[PDB]
């Protein structure tokens, strides 16, 4: 607006109007100068409101461009995170037993519920009280899913390690149940 020539035209028309007010020309000339000042002010109004609308729109387009760039960068970051998650879960497979059971299926499909039950190497048993502990995994080896498991650790609900010499009927009150016994496939 200010750098536009319309501002210069309005400013010089205002200067001419002040000079004619101080100069006392004829009333028809004064009406003429008021007319020229008014059309200069109308052109200034048009161009200045035009540039204000223009710069509002340009700032809007810049803001939406920022939003698009942020969305696309976050999409790239989420695709990277999903891909690395899938590839770590690939490296965590137990490929010998998994290949054995998949090649033992007549179609190549096995239900998902028996993928861990025949290929997992670690069994986590969660035990709520002592009678359950006595019945499911008494001693340092036990049986579940037709294999034999060897107890490698027992933690309590507080993630504290609990020795197997602790879990007795008289020390059952002082343990923070449930107990999470982690066993390995023998």
């Amino acid at each position: 607006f200010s750098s536009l020539p319309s501002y210069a035209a309005f400013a010089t028309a205002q200067e001419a109007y002040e000079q004619a007010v101080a100069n006392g020309d004829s009333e028809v000339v004064l009406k003429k100068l008021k007319k020229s000042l008014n059309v200069a002010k109308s052109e200034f109004d048009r161009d200045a409101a035009m540039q204000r609308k223009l710069e509002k729109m340009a700032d809007q387009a810049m803001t939406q461009m920022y939003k698009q760039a942020r969305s696309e960068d976050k999409r790239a970051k989420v695709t990277s995170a999903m891909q690395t998650m899938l590839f770590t879960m690939l490296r965590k497979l137990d490929n010998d037993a998994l290949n054995n059971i998949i090649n033992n299926a007549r179609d190549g499909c096995v239900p998902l519920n028996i993928i861990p039950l025949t290929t997992a190497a670690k069994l986590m048993v969660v035990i709520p009280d002592y009678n359950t502990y006595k019945n499911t995994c008494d001693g340092t080896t036990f049986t579940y899913a037709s294999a034999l498991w060897e107890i490698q650790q027992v933690v309590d609900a507080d993630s504290k390690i609990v020795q197997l010499s602790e879990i007795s009927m008289d020390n059952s009150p002082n343990l923070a149940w449930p107990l999470i016994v982690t066993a390995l496939r023998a």
Partner: protein, 75 residues
Amino acid sequence: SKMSDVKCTSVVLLSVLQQLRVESSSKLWAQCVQLHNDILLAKDTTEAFEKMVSLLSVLLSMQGAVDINKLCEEM
């Protein structure tokens, strides 16, 4: 209001115990939660006060977590 000041002091007292990280000790947090829920569902003020004694005595049991001689001084 005497019944409904113990029902609100249980709320404040369990909030204090939870901020002192009681809940990292699961056997203690189970008893504190059970005392809180028993006070809130209580109709007789005597049993509410006995459960409030038992619950507050968890807070007094831990030595340096509070500063009882400073908090009680202002009263």
